[PDB]
Design a binder for these strands. Sequence first.
DNA 1: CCGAGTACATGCACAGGATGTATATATCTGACACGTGCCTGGAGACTAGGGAGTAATCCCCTTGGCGGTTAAAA
Length: 50
Amino acid sequence: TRLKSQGHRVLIYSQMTRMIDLLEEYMVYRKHTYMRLDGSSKISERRDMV
DNA sequence: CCGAGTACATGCACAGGATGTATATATCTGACACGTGCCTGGAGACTAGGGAGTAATCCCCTTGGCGGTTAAAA
């Protein structure tokens, strides 16, 4: 929220995938758009997201 | 000479990730699907005629039922 008045880029590094899923479920209710990068999605979807 | 301990090696377990799998979906197309009238081979109704098998007896063989003997089953 302090960075919201700033408006820079924020990246989250999580070792556990379940914490990334819970981070997407928690960030979805905050109306904050983001994307998840893991070893799950195909290189095409990761290439489009990148 | 023996015991304690530190160090190196190792093995097992967990988590990530890649690849195989299977179903959900999309779409244009051969083929079921559906009128439109034809008609001619069928399908049935209506008299008349035929006929073979059902039904009842009844005579007559072929079954099913008695006691031993050894031969085959055990």
